[PDB]
Coordinates of N, CA, C and O in Angstrom, one line a residue:
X1 N 12.2 7.9 3.2 CA 12.5 8.8 2.1 C 11.6 8.5 0.9 O 11.4 9.3 0.0
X2 N 11.0 7.3 0.9 CA 9.9 7.1 -0.1 C 8.7 8.0 0.3 O 8.3 8.1 1.4
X3 N 8.2 8.7 -0.7 CA 7.1 9.6 -0.5 C 5.9 9.0 -1.1 O 5.9 8.7 -2.3
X4 N 4.8 8.8 -0.4 CA 3.6 8.1 -0.8 C 2.4 9.0 -1.0 O 2.2 9.9 -0.1
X5 N 1.6 8.8 -2.0 CA 0.4 9.5 -2.2 C -0.8 8.6 -2.6 O -0.7 7.9 -3.7
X6 N -1.8 8.6 -1.8 CA -3.0 7.8 -2.1 C -4.0 8.6 -3.0 O -4.0 9.8 -2.9
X7 N -4.9 7.8 -3.7 CA -6.0 8.4 -4.4 C -7.1 7.4 -4.5 O -6.9 6.2 -4.3
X8 N -8.3 7.8 -4.8 CA -9.4 6.9 -5.1 C -10.5 6.9 -4.1 O -11.5 6.2 -4.3
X9 N -10.3 7.6 -3.0 CA -11.3 7.6 -1.9 C -12.6 8.2 -2.3 O -12.7 8.9 -3.3
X10 N -13.6 8.0 -1.5 CA -14.9 8.7 -1.7 C -16.1 7.9 -1.1 O -15.9 7.0 -0.2
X11 N -17.3 8.2 -1.5 CA -18.5 7.6 -1.0 C -18.8 6.4 -1.9 O -18.8 6.5 -3.1
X12 N -19.2 5.3 -1.2 CA -19.6 4.1 -1.9 C -20.8 3.5 -1.2 O -20.9 3.5 0.0
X13 N -21.7 2.9 -2.0 CA -22.9 2.2 -1.4 C -22.5 0.9 -0.8 O -21.6 0.2 -1.3
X14 N -23.1 0.5 0.3 CA -22.8 -0.8 0.9 C -23.0 -1.9 -0.1 O -24.0 -1.9 -0.8
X15 N -22.1 -2.9 -0.1 CA -22.2 -3.9 -1.1 C -21.4 -3.6 -2.3 O -21.1 -4.4 -3.2
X16 N -21.0 -2.3 -2.4 CA -20.3 -1.8 -3.6 C -18.8 -2.1 -3.6 O -18.3 -2.7 -2.6
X17 N -18.1 -1.6 -4.6 CA -16.6 -1.8 -4.7 C -15.9 -0.4 -5.0 O -16.5 0.5 -5.5
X18 N -14.7 -0.4 -4.7 CA -13.8 0.8 -4.9 C -12.4 0.4 -4.9 O -11.9 -0.5 -4.2
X19 N -11.6 1.0 -5.9 CA -10.2 0.7 -6.0 C -9.4 1.9 -5.5 O -9.6 3.0 -6.0
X20 N -8.5 1.7 -4.5 CA -7.6 2.7 -4.1 C -6.2 2.5 -4.8 O -5.8 1.4 -5.1
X21 N -5.6 3.6 -5.0 CA -4.2 3.6 -5.7 C -3.2 4.4 -4.8 O -3.6 5.3 -4.0
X22 N -2.0 4.0 -4.9 CA -0.9 4.7 -4.2 C 0.3 4.7 -5.0 O 0.7 3.7 -5.6
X23 N 0.9 5.9 -5.2 CA 2.1 6.0 -6.0 C 3.3 6.5 -5.1 O 3.1 7.4 -4.3
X24 N 4.5 6.0 -5.3 CA 5.6 6.5 -4.6 C 6.3 7.5 -5.6 O 6.3 7.3 -6.8
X25 N 6.7 8.7 -5.0 CA 7.2 9.8 -5.8 C 8.6 9.4 -6.5 O 8.9 9.9 -7.6
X26 N 9.3 8.4 -5.9 CA 10.5 8.0 -6.5 C 10.5 6.5 -6.7 O 9.4 5.8 -6.8
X27 N 11.7 5.9 -6.9 CA 11.7 4.4 -7.1 C 11.7 3.7 -5.8 O 12.3 4.2 -4.8
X28 N 11.0 2.6 -5.7 CA 10.9 1.8 -4.5 C 11.9 0.6 -4.8 O 11.7 -0.1 -5.7
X29 N 12.9 0.5 -3.9 CA 13.9 -0.5 -4.1 C 13.5 -1.9 -3.7 O 12.4 -2.1 -3.2
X30 N 14.3 -2.9 -4.0 CA 13.9 -4.3 -4.0 C 13.4 -4.9 -2.6 O 12.6 -5.8 -2.6
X31 N 14.0 -4.4 -1.5 CA 13.7 -5.0 -0.2 C 12.5 -4.4 0.5 O 12.2 -4.8 1.6
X32 N 11.7 -3.5 -0.2 CA 10.5 -3.0 0.4 C 9.3 -4.0 0.5 O 9.1 -4.8 -0.4
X33 N 8.5 -3.8 1.6 CA 7.1 -4.2 1.5 C 6.3 -3.0 1.4 O 6.6 -1.9 1.9
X34 N 5.2 -3.1 0.6 CA 4.2 -2.0 0.5 C 2.9 -2.5 1.2 O 2.5 -3.7 1.0
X35 N 2.2 -1.7 1.9 CA 1.0 -2.1 2.6 C -0.1 -1.0 2.6 O 0.1 0.2 2.3
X36 N -1.2 -1.5 3.1 CA -2.4 -0.6 3.3 C -2.8 -0.8 4.8 O -2.9 -1.9 5.3
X37 N -3.1 0.3 5.4 CA -3.6 0.4 6.8 C -4.9 1.2 6.8 O -5.1 1.9 5.8
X38 N -5.7 1.1 7.8 CA -6.9 2.0 7.9 C -7.2 2.4 9.3 O -6.8 1.7 10.2
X39 N -7.9 3.5 9.4 CA -8.3 4.0 10.8 C -9.7 4.4 10.7 O -10.0 5.4 10.0
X40 N -10.6 3.7 11.4 CA -12.0 4.0 11.4 C -12.3 5.0 12.5 O -11.5 5.3 13.4
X41 N -13.5 5.6 12.5 CA -13.9 6.6 13.5 C -13.7 6.1 14.9 O -14.4 5.1 15.2
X42 N -13.0 6.8 15.7 CA -12.8 6.4 17.1 C -12.1 5.1 17.3 O -12.1 4.6 18.5
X43 N -11.5 4.5 16.3 CA -10.8 3.3 16.5 C -9.3 3.4 16.2 O -8.9 4.4 15.7
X44 N -8.6 2.4 16.6 CA -7.2 2.3 16.4 C -6.8 2.0 15.0 O -7.5 1.2 14.4
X45 N -5.7 2.5 14.5 CA -5.3 2.2 13.1 C -5.0 0.7 13.1 O -4.5 0.1 14.1
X46 N -5.4 0.1 12.0 CA -5.1 -1.3 11.8 C -4.6 -1.7 10.5 O -4.9 -1.1 9.5
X47 N -3.9 -2.8 10.4 CA -3.4 -3.4 9.2 C -4.6 -3.9 8.3 O -5.5 -4.4 8.8
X48 N -4.4 -3.7 7.0 CA -5.4 -4.2 6.0 C -4.7 -5.3 5.1 O -5.2 -6.4 5.1
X49 N -3.6 -4.9 4.5 CA -3.0 -5.8 3.5 C -1.6 -5.4 3.2 O -1.2 -4.2 3.3
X50 N -0.7 -6.4 2.7 CA 0.6 -6.0 2.4 C 1.1 -6.9 1.2 O 0.6 -8.0 1.0
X51 N 2.1 -6.4 0.5 CA 2.7 -7.2 -0.6 C 4.2 -7.0 -0.7 O 4.6 -5.8 -0.5
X52 N 4.9 -8.0 -0.9 CA 6.4 -7.9 -1.1 C 6.6 -7.2 -2.4 O 6.2 -7.8 -3.4
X53 N 7.3 -6.1 -2.5 CA 7.5 -5.4 -3.7 C 8.2 -6.2 -4.8 O 7.8 -6.1 -6.0
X54 N 9.3 -7.0 -4.4 CA 10.0 -7.7 -5.4 C 9.5 -9.2 -5.5 O 9.7 -9.8 -6.6
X55 N 9.0 -9.7 -4.5 CA 8.6 -11.1 -4.4 C 7.2 -11.4 -4.7 O 6.8 -12.6 -5.1
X56 N 6.3 -10.5 -4.4 CA 4.9 -10.7 -4.7 C 4.0 -11.4 -3.7 O 2.8 -11.5 -3.9
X57 N 4.6 -11.9 -2.6 CA 3.8 -12.6 -1.6 C 2.9 -11.6 -0.9 O 3.3 -10.4 -0.7
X58 N 1.7 -12.0 -0.5 CA 0.8 -11.1 0.2 C 0.4 -11.5 1.6 O 0.7 -12.7 2.0
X59 N -0.2 -10.6 2.4 CA -0.7 -11.0 3.7 C -2.0 -10.1 3.8 O -1.9 -8.9 3.4
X60 N -3.0 -10.6 4.4 CA -4.3 -9.9 4.6 C -4.7 -10.0 6.1 O -4.6 -11.0 6.7
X61 N -5.3 -8.9 6.6 CA -6.0 -8.9 7.9 C -7.2 -9.8 7.8 O -7.8 -9.9 6.8
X62 N -7.6 -10.3 9.0 CA -8.7 -11.2 9.1 C -10.0 -10.5 8.7 O -11.0 -11.1 8.2
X63 N -10.1 -9.2 8.8 CA -11.3 -8.4 8.5 C -11.5 -8.4 7.0 O -12.6 -8.1 6.6
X64 N -10.5 -8.8 6.2 CA -10.6 -8.8 4.7 C -11.5 -10.0 4.2 O -12.4 -9.8 3.5
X65 N -11.1 -11.2 4.7 CA -11.8 -12.4 4.3 C -12.1 -12.5 2.8 O -13.2 -12.8 2.3
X66 N -11.0 -12.3 2.0 CA -11.1 -12.5 0.5 C -11.8 -11.4 -0.2 O -12.0 -11.4 -1.4
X67 N -12.3 -10.3 0.5 CA -13.1 -9.2 -0.1 C -12.2 -8.2 -0.8 O -12.6 -7.5 -1.7
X68 N -11.0 -8.0 -0.3 CA -10.0 -7.1 -0.8 C -8.8 -7.8 -1.4 O -8.5 -8.9 -1.0
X69 N -8.2 -7.1 -2.4 CA -7.0 -7.7 -3.0 C -6.0 -6.6 -3.2 O -6.3 -5.5 -3.7
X70 N -4.8 -6.8 -2.7 CA -3.7 -5.9 -2.9 C -2.9 -6.3 -4.1 O -2.6 -7.5 -4.3
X71 N -2.5 -5.4 -4.9 CA -1.7 -5.7 -6.1 C -0.7 -4.5 -6.3 O -0.8 -3.5 -5.6
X72 N 0.3 -4.7 -7.2 CA 1.3 -3.7 -7.5 C 1.6 -3.6 -9.0 O 1.3 -4.5 -9.7
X73 N 2.1 -2.5 -9.4 CA 2.7 -2.4 -10.7 C 4.1 -1.7 -10.5 O 4.1 -0.5 -10.4
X74 N 5.1 -2.5 -10.5 CA 6.5 -2.0 -10.3 C 6.9 -0.9 -11.3 O 7.5 0.1 -10.9
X75 N 6.5 -1.1 -12.5 CA 6.8 -0.1 -13.6 C 6.2 1.2 -13.3 O 6.7 2.2 -13.9
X76 N 5.1 1.3 -12.6 CA 4.5 2.5 -12.3 C 4.7 3.0 -10.8 O 4.2 4.1 -10.4
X77 N 5.6 2.3 -10.1 CA 5.8 2.6 -8.7 C 4.5 2.7 -7.9 O 4.3 3.7 -7.1
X78 N 3.6 1.8 -8.2 CA 2.2 1.9 -7.6 C 1.8 0.6 -6.9 O 2.2 -0.5 -7.3
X79 N 1.0 0.8 -5.9 CA 0.3 -0.3 -5.2 C -1.2 0.0 -5.2 O -1.6 1.2 -5.1
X80 N -2.0 -1.0 -5.2 CA -3.4 -0.8 -5.3 C -4.2 -1.6 -4.3 O -3.6 -2.7 -3.8
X81 N -5.3 -1.2 -3.9 CA -6.2 -2.0 -3.0 C -7.6 -2.0 -3.7 O -8.3 -1.0 -3.7
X82 N -7.9 -3.2 -4.2 CA -9.3 -3.4 -4.7 C -10.2 -3.8 -3.6 O -10.0 -4.9 -3.0
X83 N -11.2 -3.0 -3.3 CA -12.1 -3.3 -2.2 C -13.5 -3.7 -2.8 O -14.1 -2.9 -3.5
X84 N -14.0 -4.9 -2.4 CA -15.3 -5.4 -2.8 C -16.2 -5.7 -1.7 O -15.7 -5.8 -0.5
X85 N -17.5 -5.8 -1.9 CA -18.5 -6.2 -0.9 C -18.3 -5.3 0.3 O -18.2 -5.7 1.4
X86 N -18.2 -4.0 0.1 CA -18.0 -3.0 1.1 C -19.1 -2.9 2.2 O -20.3 -3.1 1.8
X87 N -18.7 -2.7 3.4 CA -19.7 -2.7 4.5 C -19.4 -1.4 5.3 O -18.3 -0.8 5.1
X88 N -20.4 -0.9 6.1 CA -20.2 0.3 6.9 C -18.9 0.2 7.8 O -18.3 1.2 8.1
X89 N -18.6 -1.0 8.2 CA -17.5 -1.3 9.1 C -16.2 -0.8 8.4 O -15.2 -0.5 9.0
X90 N -16.2 -0.8 7.0 CA -15.1 -0.5 6.2 C -14.9 1.0 6.1 O -13.9 1.5 5.4
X91 N -15.8 1.8 6.6 CA -15.6 3.3 6.5 C -14.4 3.6 7.4 O -14.3 3.2 8.5
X92 N -13.4 4.4 6.7 CA -12.2 4.7 7.4 C -11.3 5.6 6.5 O -11.6 5.8 5.3
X93 N -10.2 6.1 7.1 CA -9.1 6.7 6.3 C -8.2 5.5 6.0 O -7.7 4.8 6.9
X94 N -7.9 5.3 4.7 CA -7.0 4.3 4.2 C -5.6 4.9 3.9 O -5.5 5.9 3.2
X95 N -4.6 4.3 4.4 CA -3.2 4.8 4.3 C -2.3 3.8 3.6 O -2.4 2.6 3.9
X96 N -1.6 4.3 2.6 CA -0.5 3.6 2.0 C 0.7 3.7 2.8 O 1.0 4.7 3.4
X97 N 1.5 2.6 3.0 CA 2.7 2.6 3.8 C 3.8 1.8 3.1 O 3.5 0.8 2.4
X98 N 5.1 2.1 3.4 CA 6.2 1.3 3.0 C 7.1 0.9 4.1 O 7.2 1.6 5.1
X99 N 7.7 -0.3 4.0 CA 8.6 -0.8 5.0 C 9.9 -1.4 4.4 O 9.8 -2.4 3.7
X100 N 11.0 -0.7 4.5 CA 12.3 -1.2 4.0 C 12.8 -2.4 4.8 O 13.0 -2.2 6.0
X101 N 12.9 -3.6 4.2 CA 13.3 -4.8 4.9 C 14.5 -5.5 4.3 O 14.4 -6.6 3.9
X102 N 15.7 -4.8 4.3 CA 16.9 -5.3 3.6 C 17.4 -6.6 4.3 O 18.2 -7.3 3.7
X103 N 17.0 -6.8 5.6 CA 17.5 -8.0 6.3 C 16.4 -9.0 6.6 O 16.5 -9.8 7.5
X104 N 15.3 -8.9 5.8 CA 14.2 -9.8 5.9 C 14.6 -11.3 5.8 O 15.5 -11.6 5.0
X105 N 14.0 -12.2 6.5 CA 14.3 -13.6 6.5 C 13.6 -14.3 5.4 O 14.0 -15.4 4.9
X106 N 12.4 -13.8 4.9 CA 11.7 -14.4 3.8 C 10.9 -13.4 3.0 O 10.9 -12.2 3.4
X107 N 10.2 -13.8 2.0 CA 9.4 -12.9 1.2 C 8.1 -12.6 1.8 O 7.3 -11.7 1.2
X108 N 7.7 -13.2 2.8 CA 6.4 -13.0 3.4 C 6.4 -11.5 4.0 O 7.3 -11.2 4.7
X109 N 5.4 -10.7 3.6 CA 5.5 -9.3 4.0 C 5.1 -9.0 5.4 O 4.4 -9.8 6.0
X110 N 5.5 -7.9 6.0 CA 5.2 -7.5 7.3 C 3.8 -7.0 7.4 O 3.2 -6.5 6.5
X111 N 3.2 -7.0 8.7 CA 1.9 -6.4 9.0 C 2.0 -5.4 10.0 O 1.0 -5.0 10.6
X112 N 3.2 -4.9 10.4 CA 3.4 -3.9 11.4 C 4.8 -3.3 11.2 O 5.6 -3.7 10.5
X113 N 5.0 -2.2 11.9 CA 6.3 -1.5 12.0 C 6.7 -0.9 10.6 O 7.8 -0.9 10.3
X114 N 5.7 -0.3 9.9 CA 6.0 0.4 8.7 C 6.4 1.8 9.0 O 6.0 2.4 10.0
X115 N 7.3 2.3 8.2 CA 8.0 3.6 8.5 C 7.7 4.8 7.7 O 7.8 5.9 8.1
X116 N 7.3 4.5 6.4 CA 6.9 5.6 5.5 C 5.4 5.5 5.3 O 4.8 4.4 5.1
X117 N 4.7 6.7 5.3 CA 3.3 6.8 5.3 C 2.7 7.8 4.4 O 3.3 8.9 4.3
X118 N 1.7 7.5 3.7 CA 0.9 8.5 2.9 C 0.0 9.3 3.8 O 0.0 9.1 5.0
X119 N -0.7 10.3 3.3 CA -1.5 11.2 4.0 C -2.9 10.6 4.3 O -3.7 11.2 5.1
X120 N -3.2 9.6 3.5 CA -4.5 8.9 3.7 C -5.6 9.4 2.7 O -5.6 10.5 2.2
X121 N -6.5 8.5 2.4 CA -7.7 8.9 1.6 C -8.9 8.3 2.3 O -8.9 7.2 2.8
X122 N -10.0 9.1 2.4 CA -11.2 8.7 3.2 C -12.1 7.9 2.3 O -12.4 8.3 1.2
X123 N -12.6 6.8 2.9 CA -13.6 6.0 2.2 C -14.9 5.9 3.1 O -14.7 5.6 4.3
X124 N -16.0 6.3 2.6 CA -17.3 6.3 3.4 C -18.2 5.3 2.7 O -18.6 5.5 1.6
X125 N -18.6 4.3 3.5 CA -19.6 3.3 3.0 C -20.9 3.6 3.6 O -21.1 3.5 4.9
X126 N -21.9 3.9 2.8 CA -23.3 4.2 3.3 C -24.2 3.0 3.4 O -24.2 2.2 2.5
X127 N -24.9 3.0 4.6 CA -25.8 1.9 4.8 C -27.0 1.9 3.9 O -27.7 2.9 3.9

């Protein structure tokens, strides 16, 4: 029931940076994880990063290697993905997602099985 909308996509030069934003149309309650996924041309969708909405713990895909940072602003119902040192490999549609986890065992966020999805924003990194 959380409705998600991404923004910030576009063309960026290799080695460059870009910040993506995602806002939920309503309030995101305390047990959510918020995350980013991406789908490259002809490839399977894959996890990028996640953050616990109330707890702040993060998780990143190996493909990130410290180049991307996920952050949030609870007061704005927003999650962000700061992308640095962009490479052609990073060309993809980037999706904001939410996962309600009321029975979670810890604050460490999920990297799979997200249920609410944005429509995606396209990022093109030029060689």
